[PDB]
């Protein structure tokens, strides 16, 4: 499993792979690990599939209910704070998950939350078994001045490196771009396939 | 006698407290909803009582979710409680099944909650009438709810003080499968027909939804070019 | 006096609140059920009050499961609660034993629920009469339930305002082991005989079940070619 | 006054609600039981009110187990609840001790349940009279239970509207240690003596048990050759 | 007024419901108990109302254990509940301490149970009077209990309708340390003195206990040779 | 009006049910207590109503522990409950702290229990007046308790029907630091002064305690040589 | 009749106990709030009844947090309870989400609490009217709450005895987007216009908040240079 | 009507039971408290009703802790319960935070407890008025509490029957920042001014506290040299 | 993790570093470990991130609520006493944290609280894995007579020594100064960066 989320000047880019291991061995090649949970909020999931899917449904209900009562979207920091409280409340019977939350309320944010509810903001973050390989790519190539197109290429390259070195990761790459002007936009598979050919990652 | 608490039947078999709660509904604001071609709309009358009131909290159409809206009449405090119950009930179904397939079941859960307040002593019934409209897997729907808990489906219906005047107008002029522009025009005419001789219609709130899309709340300028 | 709350006996030994709940039943819609050769059928009258009501939510025959159906009279909100209770009770038996062997026990569980609401203070009795029909291991069955909780088995029975007129007709013309076509024809004639002098019968809902098969709801066209 | 709720004593020391529940018993069907040589029998009157009722659900003798039977009078819905309580209570004793030694203790548990409904507010008493008969370790037994909870043992007893007429007949003609054929013949004569001048006896239900065997329900033909 | 529920004091300071429960005691059967030399005896009157009643269930002396017996007057259903409570309370003491040292504490537990039913709303008081007799570590004991919960110790006492007649006789003829034969003879004479002018005494039940031995119930023949 | 249940204030601010409970106290037996030199004594009047009552259960001085005694007036059944509560409360303090330092706190716990029965609906107040006397770490103490829960300390006090007569006598003749022999003599004279003109004093019960020692109950012969 | 407890509807559909609670509001102190340019202010009248009262506990503007303030009218003890509930509710939102985004939801939680006290028996409604003002993510807000639970948003509003006089003045002189100095001057004039002919205005309390900053309570000298 | 239970509003908006509880306060003993230079004092009137009462339990100033004292008027049994609640509440704050910073919060907790007894049915309000005085982090404080739960701060205040007479005197003669000797002298004069024409002041109890020190209770001799 | 708090004549100085380790390895370089919880009160957190963040939100709510009801700030000793009760109540299912609380009610105080609720006052204290290195610097250089400027230099030097020797500590140094005259003042990053150059700690 490899998930990545980065921040740009007015954009948030999130991308994951699709390989799912269940009862050992590769039993699913096209799993879903990137979810839209609000108008300008996305979440990626790593860890146990059962716990992660339950949390995704919980956040979708809470954020939609919050929107109807407050007539405004939940701020990204409030989204991470709410998740932090839920995970810490059952820390001794915990969800075995690692989560990334990203979006734009007035500025782009990416939050990393662990199983015990520890939440911390960062310009970029990666989770899963393939994350350390991604951090190597981001440490040497990430720049806050990149354009959206350049940022999409970077996350594709970083995940491609993880797929070469992490056996638990694989499959087709899913990419979502979040901006105020376009909202939550999931990039078509044909565009990403074109990008990998142009980038040289086969 | 048989008019105080609910858990008394009248000798001829009526619940007076339920009937008395219906009188409180007749003193509420007038609202209506109509079905049209591939959609359903909600119209609620908004009258102004003072220039010191912030015009925006007069929201009379409450969105239960992105695809279901409701309008209420009667006691506003009781209505707000029921609307909150509907919103939580809608999210529980989405958590359990991943989607909302039939709006009628959501309305039934609300109606069950009001029914228990007419059978168990120690409480009074809700003095609220509700109209539910939206799009589900079967298509556009339109429902009503009364203080007793009665549920009916309609092509067009109205609640409030002017319910009789609006319903009588729809009994004579309503047509099915109309365009949204035509249906809103008919709705305004129906609502106008209820205003006490002399009073002029004031900019109401209109919300409509079509199959495939989400609910859309009419802007005040778009409402203005309908009167 | 002895007419307010239930947990009072009258000096001559009647529960007035139970009797008053029976008056609410007499104001409900008229329905009937008959046994025929290897089957049982349900007929419920559907009158129209306005052209603005969606004809489909007027479902008066509720399927408890694929082999048991019910029809109710009286307060529709109280009836809906009892129907939901029956559906959950039916599924609990299927979970426990893997099947439903006797319909009478399902009816008894519903009747027990209504009986406790006539003996424990703080609640009012259900103003609902029910008819249960279906196929079980012993064969076709037909039951009734009253607000007090009385249960009887019948070859033919009726509930509602026109119960006396329908029962009197069946008291004179009913025959056993009739074909389904003949039994439905007799049922329509029995129901027609109750309409207030002048009123014309309008397309009702008919549901029948035969041994081996499941419940079948008559389509509106098939109902039409019976009047 | 002192006639509404139970937890009031009358100035002269009566519970009117308990007495009013006794009036409901006087409106029930008439039943009787007699002891004979090494056995005990139960006789209950079954009158027909319509030809549309399935004759089989008119079961007036309920088997608590294979060796204990009961017959009830008064409110049928209250009686059904008490019969179910007795059946569960009988099985609990069998689970605890592996057998049922004394029927009187089973009757006492039923009577205790009815007694608490005459002392604790918020409930009304059961309007039911019961007769228990069967074989236990000590021999044939015959018991009665009233709405208050009074228990007595009898060689012969009756309940219902015709209780006075049957008891008076047994007060004059009853003999002990009769053969089952003779005892049933005397029972039919006793029951006949209660029918309103003019009415004819109709085929009743007879159940008898002898030491060593289980309860036997008389077939309709065997009952017929007794009238 | 001040006569309905218990948790009302009368202006002059009486509990009318407790007093009304005392009236129900005055309608019960007459029973008495006397102390004699190294023992105590219980006598209860048994009248026959019909030849159809099994003479054996008329047991009016209930053994709380092998060394304590009780007799009750008033409502038999309320009395049976209190007797069962005493039996369970007696066994709890034996489990805790391995023996029963003072009968008075067992009587106090019964009296405490009846006292709470005269102070807490929602219940009515027990309409029962009780007499307790037996042998404990201190010797022969004789106690009474009333619906309020008052407890007294006596050399001789009586309860029931004929309580005044029996007590007046014992007020004049009772002597201490009599032989059991003499004490039973005096008891029968005291009880006879209460029978309505004309009525004849019928074989009663007599139970006596002496220090060292257990309770002994008189056989019907031994009772007969006392009249 | 304002006289039924407690949780009603009267317009001028009285609790009538509490006042009505005070009337029940005025019908109880007369008792008194006095302080003397390094000690405190309790005197309670014992009248005889019949020679059939065992003289020993007339114990009117109840020992809460070896150093605290109590005497009660009013309803004996309510008084017995309060005495048992005091005994358990006294042992709880000994378990917690290893000793009982102040008697006043034990009295306050009893008074708190009676106060809650005058403020919470669903119960009636205790119709009991109590006097507490004993030796604690601070010295000899003497307390009273009323149905409302009022607590006062006294050099000498009385309760019951003859409370006014005894208190008036002590208002005129009481002296402090008297010898125990003199104090008992004064107490008997005070109690005698209350007997209805004509009635003669009968042997009462006297209990006294001195600093350092435990409570001592006067034998009947020692009481006799005081009259 | 229909005026005692809440869970009764009046025949024409009013809750008299809710209306009677509104009368208690009309006897409270007069307070008002106004919106101005990028801010909102609160003004409450403080009259002096004696020179022995410490002037500082007369705080009529309670800060729910650093950015939300409230003013109350009616029963001060009921108002204090509601203010404490609002403060705890505000901190719960901050713990859950890390911030408070919409003041309206905090007001709704308070209104929901008061609504349940008008529908569930056993309690009386709060006799309190409240005004909420502060800055949230959407901007300056101004709300009112009534005993029933009705919520409205305002550019300017008043509560208390002089509510009609202040509102009428604001109906004629109020202008939007005024400077804070001008808005406070208008508020004092509006409040003065309500004083009973003859009485002179006394130094009130004024609290204002602007976007970006926290709430500021006017010092007594700064208030003085406004009269 | 509207005067029985609390959870009824009067048509004009008063709680009669709360008002009736205020009448019970007017029948209590008269007490007062005054602020002086760097301190606060408490004065309570102690009248003698008999020479048989131990003078020491007449303690009318109860120390909540070493720095907070209270005086009560009205029902002494209700007052004792509230004083115990305050003492436990004070110790809970010390356990949680290690100190007591504001006395006003302790008074508010007591007032909240009394407020809930005027809003929840099934209980009656406390008929107690309280005055709280002491030293906290902010300085000397003086508070009052009423049966409804109203709280005010004062430079000088009084409660009880003579509250009007004492307050009127303090309205005319009270001065701030007086020496303790002068303030006590003024307090005695104020209290004397309330005695019914003819009655003479009797030695009262005086308690004072200064910043830095603890509460000091005046000895009877020091009180004597003030009259 | 390295946190330090010292007391001066009329001031309290608190400073922490920013390195956060999550799922092992340095995944965040700019974490937040120094919080203002009242007008004149600050708190530093060491240990599990999830438990620490929950406690910070709890203290902010409790202290603000206490201020509104009592119209006065909670005393610093009362702040430590309240924290001690909460931690000891769940000592067998405890928060895995070590806390420092500092501020001025009328005098400067610094309190150290462990996971079991043990609270003790000290003139200076340090927590975290880098704390023993800080204690060495403070043992040989701390003086109660230093000025505020000198005290700021000392905590910067002490944390810099810990960063050289403790791999779990690192990142930019955050410093807060609490006085009655200025309240709670967080020193700007530019000033601390200037100080390290002037001090010689690179």
Author numbering:
A (entry chain K), I (entry chain J): 1 to 202
B (entry chain E), C (entry chain F), D (entry chain G), E (entry chain A), F (entry chain B), G (entry chain D), ...: 7 to 233
Published text:
Central to this system is the proteasome, a molecular machine that selectively degrades proteins. A hydrophobic-tyrosine-any residue (HbYX) motif on the C-termini of proteasome-activating complexes independently triggers gate-opening of the 20S core particle for protein degradation; however, the causal allosteric mechanism remains unclear. The architecture of the archaeal 20S proteasome is conserved resembling the eukaryotic 20S, but its α and β rings are homoheptameric rather than heteroheptameric.
Understanding the critical role of tyrosine in the HbYX motif, and recognizing the partial activation caused by the L81Y mutation—which was designed to mimic the tyrosine occupancy of HbYX, as identified in a concurrent study31—we moved forward with constructing a cryo-EM structure of T20S-αL81Y. Unlike the ZYA-T20S model, the conformational changes caused by L81Y were different and subtle. The T20S-αL81Y model shows that the hydroxyl group of tyrosine is within proximity to hydrogen bond with the backbone of G19, similar to ZYA’s tyrosine. Additionally, we noted that tyrosine hydrogen bonded with a water molecule that is also hydrogen bonding to the backbone of L21 but not the side chain of E25. We also noted the water which hydrogen bonds with the backbone of A30 is not displaced by L81Y, reinforcing the point that L81Y is not oriented like ZYA’s tyrosine. This structure suggests that the tyrosine interactions with G19 and L21 are sufficient to cause a Helix 0 shift upward, which consequently partially opens the gate.
